[PDB]
Recover the amino acids of this structure.
C-alpha cells in the first residue's frame, strides 16, 4: 500500500493505489484507500484493512456528529486532535498486529491566506501528529520511494493539475520498486484513486483523468 | 519465483520468470533462473538465490566431470540421483532458511519411444524425487497457480510451439495472482526465459519469440 | 472444506462440498455448509464446525429479529456490517484455534439494475469485508484450486444453470487436489449442496440436478 | 499411506496404496511403495518418502551384496536382522521428523512346512521387530482400519487369489475412513500395487487383476 | 472406555463397557456409563469419570426441570442443543484435562415414520454436534475398533435383539485391542451394560441377556479360532 | 509387563507374561520375555522391547564367548558383573526413554549347599545389582502386585511344581490389577512362559503344563 | 554509511561518504570506505568497520597473489567469484552481528565494446551476487535514498565528470534523509571520496574536484 | 534531541534543537521542543514526541486551570510538584518505551533577590526533581556534550544575550557529536528555538537573532 | 578509568588516572595503566584489569621479539596491525565481560615531517582501528568528559609542557563528572601517570611536574568558583 499527498497553490491532492495483499498473494485489485471524510478533508489510511475502514467510517461519523450538535464544524486543529486520540486508542491492538496509520489532507477555510490553506498531517503509532511544512508526504510500504520521487518532481507542482500528475507518477515509482504497491493495471483498467481539495470543497477525481495521466507516464518512460 | 516445465509430443520445455525480491522490495528485474546443465537437461531452481546459482553451477560441473572421466554421459537415472544427493546435502541449511528446490527437465536419448522421451523430475527439501506423469510440473511461490492453469490449458499442447505458449501463459497467471512472481515487463522489455530440449539437444528460446507470445496473451485478456 | 460462489446474469449461485475431517480421519460425509439465512441471502461458513453452525444460526436469528422489530428487512450493506461485527467478535477465540470464515451471497432487491443485483462478500479473521467485483470467489482449504478453475471457466457462465455447472466443477477440482475437500461420492450418492438466488428468492437446489451434473463431469474427464 | 500384508495357504501377498501428501495437499497420485528386494522378499515402507525409497534401495543392495560375496543368500533371520539394524540407525533422524517404518514379507524356502513358510515381520522406530502370528499386518496412517477390516475378512482367505482380494478390500476400507490413503481412482485408472511371493519367488501382480478386484468391491458396496 | 450405539428397525440400542483405569492400574470393574436420562433418551459419557457422572446428573435434572415448568417435554432438537451448550461450557476445564465427551441416543415420538424414529448424536469438545445417519457410532478410547467392527456387522441388524448382539460384540473387539476397555469378565460375572429405546420408552437390559450373548460371542470366537489358522499354521 | 522369579528347594523358576503395548493399544499377544542365556542362567527383561531383546542376545553371546576362549564358564559373580556393566552402559538411553531392566535367575553349581544354590539378582537403571534374599523377585509394571502376592503364597512353595504354580498365580494377580500385563488368554490358548533351572540345567516348561495350572487357578477363583 | 557506483559512457565511478557511528554517536569524521583493490577494480564495503577493512585488504592481497603466481590477472568473472566466496565465508559472523557487504566496481579490459566495459556487482550476506544492468548501485543505510535519487538524475550522465557530479549528489541526498550518512562538512573541509576507473586504470579523484562539485550542489539547493 | 538551559544575571534562557528521528531516518526538521507554559515558566521536553507534546499541553492547561479557580497563580514549588506527579504518572508507559523527560525553567517573582530569581529544575523517570544550583543543565541524547561545553563557556555569561550565545553554541556541539541532534541547517534556514525569561515574563526569541548567533559560531570555528 | 592522549608540536603525550574499582568499592588507589611498550610507543588499556595488564605485557614481548629476530623494529603500521590482531583475539572473552580496549601512542621516526610525526590510534572491541586526526583521543568510563574537555582546551597546546597540562586537566574533568575515575589525591599524594614521547624516545614524566600541575589546576578551579555565582547567587 502507498498513499501520497502534496500541496499545490490553492489546494491539496491526495492519491492512493489499489492493491491489497495477504502475504505474497494478491487478494484485491480495487481497494479504495482515500475517503472524503467531510466537505474539506480527505483521509487516507494504510495498514490492516479492517482497522483502516473502521477508522475512516468512525472518523467521518464523529466529525459530522459534532457539526450537528454545535451547528458549526470543528476547526482544523480539532479535527487533527480527534483523529490523533482515535489513533492513540488503537495502540494496544496495534502492538498486536492491527496497526493502521492515517494521513490527513485538508483545506482550512479559516486560514488567513487562501493560497496556502492546504494542510497535510501525518501520524505515527503513538498518536503523535505532525503538520507537514515541506509540501508533500506519503505513508505505506512504498512510502520511501514515493517521497524520494516527489522530492525530485515537486518543483513542477504549480496548480491542482500538475500536482495530480506528480502524485500519479510518485505512486508509479512506489509500485515500481515495492511489490505490495500495485501499478497502473492497463488490462483491467484499474488505476489509483485521487481526491482534490480547494476553496470549493473536496471532490473525487474522475477515473478517466487519472487514466490519461497514467498512460501518459508509461508512454513517457517506454521511450 | 515460479518455474514451469511441460512435456510436449517429442520434447520438453522449461520456462522461468525474472523477479527476485527481499521481502516486499523488488531487487532484481532480470535474473535468469533456468540453466542448461548439459546437452540434454535443464535445471530450474527456486529459493535462496545464492544456494540456487551454486547448485546449478556445481551440478553442471559434476555431470560434465564424470562424462570426461568415463567417456559417456550418465543415464538419466544417474543424473537424477546425483541431483537428489546434492539436494539432500543442503537439508541443514534449508532448515536454517537457505532452502533451494530444483526442477529437472531432460530428454532421454535412450528411451524407447522418442515421442515420450521427455522427462520431468521434482524434488523436495529432503532429497526425495518423483518422476512426473501428468505431463507438467512447477516450483516456487507461484507454482500452485501455474499448475492449476496448466491443468486446464494442457489439452492445447500439441508440439513445441503450442507447448511454449502454454508455458508462457501459465507463468502469466502465476504472476497475476502472486506478487513475488514478475510478469512480462512491457516497459523495460524483459520477458520470461525459456529452454527447449528435443532430440537435437537443448537450446535457449531467443527473446523475440517469448515477446510475441507474451503480447498475444496480453491482448487476449484485455 | 471448500465453498465456491459465483455471479451469473440475474442472480448468484453458492455451492459447498460435504466432508468434515478430524486431522487425517474422515469424520463426516454429509455436512451441509450452505444455509439460507433469509429470503435473499445464503451464507456458507468454513472452519471449526462448531463456530460455523453457530454463526449460521445466530446470524439468521439476528436478521429476522431486526425485520420483526422494524417491519422492514435490513438493506444489504447492513447485513454485511452485522456479519462483520459478529466475525470480529470471534477474533479472540479465533486466535486460539476456533476460526470460522464466512462467505455471503445475496441478491439486492433495491439494486438499480436487476441483472447485476447479485452480490458476493468475503470476510477475513479481523472482520474486514470485501464486496467482490470479479464475479466469483471461494473460501476453505481448497479455495485456491477452486478459484483457479473458476478463472478458466467463468467465461461459460451465462445464466443460473451454466453457473451451477461451473460451480460443481470447480468444487470437483478443489476436492481433486485437496484431501480435506470431498469429491462426489458415487457410491453413497452424496454430492455437494447448492443454493440459487435471484429476483424470486433463494431456493435450495434439488439433489438430482447436482447429481446429474456431477456424473456428467466425471464421465467427461474419464476419457 | 497404508500397506497390508497377509499370509495365505502357500504364500504371502503384500499390497500398498498410491497417494503421497504434503499436509492436506495431494502431491503424488502414483507412488509405488512396495518393492521386490529379492527373489523371496518384498518390502513396504511407510513414512517420509525420501527415507523410504532410500531404505528400500540400500537394503536390496546389501542383501544382494552378501549373496555375491558368500555364494548363498542369508537366512530369513539374517535378513530380518539387517533390516532391523538399518531401522535402528535412522532413529535420530526419525525423532527429527524423518521417520520410516518397514513391513517385510518373505517366503522362507528353508521352513519345514511349505504351506506355512510365509512370513510377515513388523518394525517400530526403535529397530525392534516382531514376527506376526495372527496372519496379517499393516503399516501407515490407515493401518488400524486395514487391520480391523482384515480381522473380519480373513476367514475367506483360502489361496493366492482370495488373499489378493482381501488385501485390496482392506486397502479400500483404509482409504474409506482416512483421507491420507488414496483409494482406487476409476477416472485416471490408478490402482493399488501388489506383490505375490510363493515357492517360485516374487512377482508383481499385473494391473488388470487389481482393476478387476477393485471394480468388484466397488460394485458390491453400491 | 468405549460406548457403542446403533439404530435398529423401530429403536436404538446403546451399550457400554465396565472398566475404569488410573493410568495403567485397573481401578474399577463395574462402572456404569450408560444412563437413562429420560423416558426416551439414554446418554453415554466417556472421559474423566467425575465430569462424566456430573454431566449425566445435571443433564437429567435440566430435562425434567423444563418438563415440569412447561408441562411438555422438549423436542429432540432442543435436548441436543442443551447438551451441546453444556459440553461447550466445559471446554475451559476440558483443555486443562477434565474432558468428557457424550453420546446421545434417543427415540423421537414426534418423528413422522415410527420405524426410523431412532436418533444418534455425537459431540466433540467444542460442543459441535452431529446427527448421525450411518446407523451407528462409538466414543471412547477403543472407539475406532468398535466402529470398524460394526461396519462389517451392521448388515445383520434386524430388530432390537440382533442389534443388541452386534453391540455386545463390537464392544468385545474394542476391549480386545484396547487395554483401557474391559472385556466380558467371566470370573466375576461382570458384563457391559445396555439400554434399549423404542416407542414404549427406554429400558435397561436385564443382565442375564447380555451375559448369554457374551458367552455366545466368546464360544464363537474360540471355535472360530480353533477352525482358523495363520496361513495354515496353528 | 511382569516377570517373576522364585527359588524353591533345589532350583529356581522364572516366568513372564506375553503382552506388549503401545499406550493403551495391545500390540503383541505372544512376545517371549524370558530367555535361556546359558545352561544355568535365564534372563528376563522388562521395558523397551528393542533394548530388551538386544540385551538378552548380546549377553548370551558374551557369556558363551568367554566360555569358548577360556575353556570354563565364568563364576556366577562374573556373570552378574558383566550384566551389570551392560545395564550401566544403557543408562544414557534409559534417561532418553529407552529403559530396559533385567532380572537374572541362575543355578550356582559351585555353591556349597545344593538345596540353596538357586540365585536371583535384580538390577536398577544405574547398573547396581542386588542378590535377593527373601526368596523371590519381580520386574515390570505389575511387579508390585506380583511381589505382594508371592509374599503371602510363598509358604506353599516346597518343590519345583508348587513353585511353578505360585509363579503362575503371582502373574495372574499382576495381570488382574494392571492392564499392561496380559493374563492367560483362554480364547487363543496363550499362556505365560516359564523356565526351570536346577542341578541339571535350564529347560523350558512345555506350554501344556502352564495351561493346566492356569486353568486350576481360574476355576479356583470362580 | 552509503556507497554509490554508476557506469558512464566509457568507465565507472564509485563514491562513498566519511562518517562512522556507534549508536547515535558520531565517532569518525574521515573514514575512507572505497579502496582501489587493483588497477581495474575498486571495492566499497558497508557494515562493521573491522570486517570491512579486513575484507578489502585480504581481497586485494589475493587478487595480486594469483596475478604474481600465474603471470596474468584473473578475468572479471574470477574476481567476482573470489569476492563472493569471502562474503559467503563471513556469513556465520554476519548472523552474530559482524555483517559486511561489498559493492564491486570494475572495468573489463576484455569486454567487446569499450564504451560499455564498465561493471557493477552487488552482493548479499549469503554470498550470492548480481551483475547490475540498470546502470547504478548503492549499499548502506542510505542506499535506498541514493538509488531513488540516481533513478531520476541518471539521464544527465554523459561522461566521466557528469557521472561524478551525479554520484556526489546521490550521496548528498542519502545524507539529507538519513542521519548515519555524513554530508559534505564545509566547516572542516571533509568531502566524500571517489574513485574513477576507465580504459587507463583506477585513479582517486583529487579532493579539490569533489569540493567544487559539493559546493555547487549546496548552493543550488539554497 | 537536546535541550539546554542556563541562568544569567536577571533571568534564564532555554534553547532546544529542531530535529526528530525514527531510528536512523530523519523524519522532521522543524519540531519545536520549548514551550511557554505560562507568563513566567518555559518547559522543554525530550523523548517520545507524542508523550512530549501531550505533557506540554496538559501541564499548561493545569497551571492556568488552578490560576482561574484560585485567582492567584501557583507558587513555583507547586508548579514543580505538579509536573513531577505528572512525570511519575507516566512511569508505567515510560518503562514500556514511551519515556518523556522534562526540563523546567522559570523566573520566580516572589523570590527575594530579583537578580537570582531564575530557576532550573530537572526531572528523572521516577518523578524525583532537583533544583539545579550550578547555573545550567541539559536533557536529551546529546545532553552530556552540551553540559561539557557549557562547563567551559559558562564564565562568559553576563546578561540575557551572552547567555543566548552560549546556549546556541552548546547546542551546536551537542549536534556536532550526536547524530540525533540537528545542527544549524543553513540551507533551509532552520535554527534552534529559544525562550528567554525575566522580570517582564517569558518571550520567544525572534528567529533572526538565533540565526545571527549561529552564523557567528560557524564563522568562528571555520 | 580514563586514559587521554594528545599530540603536540613535535611529540605525543599520554596520561592515565589511578583508581580501580569493583562495583561501588574503591579497590586500588595507585594502579598504573600506561606502559612504555618500546622506545617509541606507549599503550594505555582500559577495562578488565587482568586482560589489560596481559595485553600490555605480551604486546611488548612481541614487538621486541620481532626486533631481535629481524634486526629492525616493525614500522608503525606493523605495530598497529599486531595490536589489532591481539585485540580481535579477545573478542569472545570481551562478549563474556572480560573486555579490554587499548589506546596506542607512538612517535613515527620514519614520518616525513618531524613536527607531525606523533601518532594516536584507537581500537574497538572487534579489532578495527582508526588513526586519529583531530589531535587527541581518550578511552574508559570518563572518556566522553575528557574529550569534551580537550576539544575546548586544545588550542592552548603549543609544546610538551602545555600539552602535559592539558592532559592533566582533561583527566581532572573526567574524574570531576564520573565516580569510577580518580582525581589527584592531595592527601596521599597520588597523581595521574604520564608518558611523553618525542624524537628522543619515550620517558615517564617524573611525579613532581604532575604534582604541581594538578595543584595549579585545583587552585584555579577554587578561585574561579569563588568569582562565579549561580546567576547572581553564591
Amino acid at each position: 500500500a502507498t498513499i501520497v499527498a502534496l500541496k499545490y497553490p490553492g489546494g491539496v491532492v491526495m492519491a492512493g493505489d489499489r492493491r491489497s495483499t495477504q502475504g505474497n498473494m494478491i487478494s484485491g485489485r480495487d481497494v479504495r484507500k482515500v475517503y472524503i471524510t467531510d466537505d474539506y478533508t480527505a483521509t487516507g489510511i494504510a495498514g490492516t484493512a479492517a482497522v483502516a475502514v473502521e477508522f475512516a467510517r468512525l472518523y467521518a461519523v464523529e466529525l459530522e456528529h459534532y457539526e450537528k450538535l454545535e451547528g458549526v464544524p470543528l476547526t482544523f486543529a480539532g479535527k487533527i486532535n480527534r483523529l490523533a486520540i482515535m489513533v492513540r486508542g488503537n495502540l494496544a491492538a496495534a502492538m498486536q498486529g492491527l496497526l493502521a496509520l492515517p494521513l490527513l489532507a485538508g483545506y482550512d477555510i479559516h486560514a488567513s491566506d487562501p493560497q496556502s490553506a492546504g494542510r497535510i498531517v501525518s501520524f505515527d503509532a503513538a498518536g503523535g501528529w505532525n503538520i507537514e511544512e515541506e509540501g508533500y508526504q506519503a505513508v505505506g510500504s512504498g512510502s520511501l520511494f514515493a517521497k524520494s520521487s516527489m522530492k525530485k518532481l515537486y518543483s513542477q507542482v504549480t496548480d491542482g493539475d500538475s500536482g495530480l500528475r506528480v502524485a500519479v507518477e510518485a505512486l508509479y515509482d512506489a509500485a515500481d520498486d515495492d511489490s505490495a504497491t500495485g501499478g497502473p493495471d492497463l488490462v483491467r483498467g484499474i488505476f489509483p484513486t485521487a481526491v482534490i481539495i480547494d476553496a470549493d470543497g473536496a471532490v473525487d477525481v474522475p477515473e478517466s483523468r487519472i487514466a490519461e495521466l497514467a498512460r501518459a507516464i508509461i508512454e513517457s518512460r517506454s521511450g
